[PDB]
Amino acid sequence: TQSKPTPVKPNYALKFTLAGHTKAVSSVKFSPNGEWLASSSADKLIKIWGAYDGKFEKTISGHKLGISDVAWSSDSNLLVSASDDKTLKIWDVSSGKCLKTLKGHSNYVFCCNFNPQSNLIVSGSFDESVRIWDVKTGKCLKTLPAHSDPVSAVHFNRDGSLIVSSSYDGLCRIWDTASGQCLKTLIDNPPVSFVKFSPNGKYILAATLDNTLKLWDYSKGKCLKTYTGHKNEKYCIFANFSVTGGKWIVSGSEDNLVYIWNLQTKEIVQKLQGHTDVVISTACHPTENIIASAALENDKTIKLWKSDC
């Protein structure tokens, strides 16, 4: 007799605190194979940690100014980083060495992602452009005049045919990867600080700097769900879909907590306490009920939390 579990709430509990960065942490990401956690920081460094035990593995260095974002390739062998030095760098994680420096942006690079094939990288910058890069050659393939204010997030869908971008200009835009042309603009116009596609490819999850997260059917232009109760008026704070156990939405917050909501009811189901500064970034492990969170410069640590569901 087979049943479907429906947990009312998770029970994430602190397991490890990861110290080592000397300035604000800016992003954390789990490797797709689930073995590693990468972190980036205003201290110009990337650090690699064991995903299950938080054990320090290595520091990856080379950027000349702070880093805002890091992202993994699909095979977990490469990382790309986005820096205030106006470059992105592609790293071989095993060797810890820089393979390519992606030059073209004219101001801080704020956000980056590989496509699932991992032959392309997308970036967004304070220069208000989105760029599409060839991983092999390290050269820019396309520059999209995407926005009229800094670009806060860029994300590919699962076949890599679409990019979604967000900006402080208050817009979310859907771009056709192959041509670079805009497919859709979603629009008051509060600054959009984060966006990504949902697991089923149908929605975008968008954060705005009015303490609001919204799940949009982008083809219809209809808001399906809204998540509130956290604090987000200043920083570009990632949000996540938790796909391993219960259906949750996860976000950091400017009141130093991690917020977790019920996807469908929109109720807060847990708040995780421990950090002593803004939780700027959270990540959800790809197969286990594990959350990584990271905080700004009064804290500078990463925390690993684990749930039974």
In angstroms, the CA 167 to CA 194 distance is 8
Beta carbons of 301 and 14 less than 8 angstroms apart? no
In angstroms, the CA 159 to CA 202 distance is 13
Q: Is 264 in the site for ligand Q1J (CB under 6 A)?
A: yes
Q: Is 248 in the site for ligand Q1J (CB under 6 A)?
A: yes
Q: Is 145 in the site for ligand Q1J (CB under 6 A)?
A: no
Considering only residues 210 to 229 of the shown chain, the ones binding ligand Q1J according to CB under 6 A are 224-225
Q: Is 243 in the site for ligand Q1J (CB under 6 A)?
A: yes
Q: Pick between residue 48 and residue 186 the one whose CB is nearest to ligand Q1J.
A: 186
Helices (H) then strands (E): counts for the chain: 0, 28
Q: Pick between residue 82 and residue 249 the one whose CB is nearest to ligand Q1J.
A: 249
The residues facing 176 across adjacent strands are 162
| Out of 198, 262, 293, 301, the residue judged to bind ligand Q1J by CB under 6 A | 198
**Rounded least distance, CB 240 to ligand Q1J, Å:** 8
| Out of 247, 266, 271, 306, the residue judged to bind ligand Q1J by CB under 6 A | 247
CA angle 97/152/187 to nearest 5° reads 150
Joined together, the tokens standing for residue 291 give 């959350």
Q: Is 242 in the site for ligand Q1J (CB under 6 A)?
A: yes
Residues 6+ apart with CB under 8 A from 75: 32, 33, 118
Give the interface with ligand Q1J as residue ranges (CB under 6 A).
198-200, 203, 224-225, 241-243, 247-248, 263-264
